[PDB]
């Protein structure tokens with residue numbers, strides 16, 4: 001039925017399911033359902049329906065790149081499925097089920113490869129809460145006691161919660177304000193950041209302090225990993241400008257109090273930022289450990305030239 | 309008497325007094341004696357004698373820059389002495405004052421140590437110097453840091469200092485010279501002692517100082533070169549290849565393994581060249597001056613007879 005419309009409203013109003021493959025489980029859900037029982041013609045009328053419902057879905061807040069990402073991957077499974085087909089619903093829904101089960105284990109396998117990086121007594125450093133970086137760092141509690149420096153930035157700040165969820169289970173964290181990321185980072189090694197979405201050229205679109213942070217990395221020459229799973233490799237190299245973000249209400253940065261000053265003064269609030277591929281020095285991923293400058297072909301491994 | 313000739317032979321054969329106030333106390337000695345009783349004319353015949361005995365003294369092994377350095381400073385005290393101008397009383401008295409001022413370098417240059425090294429801070433030095441060891445020993449009434457010392461420079465005279473430190477102080481580890489780039493990714497605050505420092509701001513030091521300072525201005529950690537006064541040499545780096553000491557290649561290849569030593573060329577340099585584009589502070593005997601200021605400090609001491 002048209003419960004997807006509710007879903008089309010659900011992404012419209014906001015209220016995030018915290019990126020935990022819930023957008024992916026949902027997009028797989030609705031694509032499974034529209035894939036299940038709909039109109040049927042042989043010659044990709046299903047694919048045309050995927051383009052229509054696709055572009056209607058992408059008409060949401062243009063930041064949830066996972067929605068269109070798994071949409072396009074469903075299309076590539078359709079194209080290869082027909083490619084071998086040269087009863088298709090059985091093969092398509094089965095392979096989509098296999099992609100679901102493969103998606104069902106990202107946060108474990110991307111966290112197994114952790115002992116091979118962090119060593120004893122090694123002052124790691126991140127910024128901003130992320131599920132994968134916390135799970136990833138929790139499987140390195142069967143090794144020695146390092147430190148963790150976490151930045152408290154990007155207000156409204158969703159960051160501390162992580163400083164709790166770590167320090168009551170693990171290593172000796174300290175929490176620094178965002179405006180002190182250059183007295184620190186003279187005494188550190190091995191920076192990690194989680195990623196909101198990563199671009200085709202090799203860019204990280206992340207939380208609103210990622211840049212200003214990576215610049216310090218390629219100033220003191222410390223390597224920064226951006227641990228990010230699959231299904232977040234977005235096409236469309238950074239052409240569209242200023243729709244790249246989320247501008248939120250300036251209540252979060254200035255209070256509605258202090259009247260009259262708020263007549264003539266301009267307030268800005270960006271949620272994301274731009275990390276170019278000239279500063280990332282490894283990707284830890286779900287299947288391999290690929291470098292920055294290789295990421296290109298990995299994208300060609302997944303998609304098809306209908307990247308629009 | 310002509311015991312200076314013995315001294316002129318003493319620097320000739322080698323056998324260093326460590327550079328620890330032997331070269332300066334001696335040069336002050338012989339300059340005091342030649343200053344004391346010699347030929348006398350009013351119009352700087354003493355100064356001409358200082359030029360003659362000076363250039364004869366500088367005809368030693370051209371690396372002991374302290375000898376000519378204190379020679380030239382004696383000349384500047386002569387020039388200012390005549391400038392204000394029984395002159396022997398004033399000259400020998402002021403030279404005595406310069407001696408007593410020279411008598412306390414390694415303490416006052418080591419007082420200013422608590423204001424730099426902090427708790428839990430992995431310092432790092434290459435080679436061994438009296439002033440860097442005394443300097444680091446007065447920071448043992450603060451917390452337990454590490455010290456990473458490189459075992460460079462065959463003959464590798466590096467360790468004695470790791471002994472003389474470890475049995476009195478912090479947890480030092482000793483690395484070979486060929487591992488100064490797996491380390492120096494996990495360090496801060498490098499220190500090096502200086503054999504002599506040039507006018508432009510250069511450090512002429514032990515034979516691994518370069519390749520180390522390059523790592524400092526690659527990972528951007530600051531390197532202090534703690535060096536007292538009297539070692540500010542004029543003569544910006546013009547004279548080439550007399551800038552060193554080439555020693556016998558027995559120290560790097562053994563006289564054993566015959567016939568290979570027919571056709572193969574062995575090199576052995578003792579010093580190297582650190583340019584002023586990489587040093588990031590000087591801790592000194594009177595102040596704490598930066599690199600790019602060092603220029604006028606030299607003009608504070610000498611006179612344009614710098615040859």
Ligand SMILES: O=C(COc1ccc(Cl)cc1)N[C@H]1CC[C@H](NC(=O)COc2ccc(Cl)cc2)CC1
Pocket residue numbers: 121122123147149174184187428429430454456481491494
């Ligand atoms: O625990 C801390 C303090 O951590 C912070 C300091 C400041 C801030 Cl803002 C946050 C955290 N510092 C330690 C961390 C281990 C290190 N390394 C060692 O203990 C020894 O490591 C070495 C030593 C020598 C070599 Cl060659 C290699 C590693 C010393 C400094």
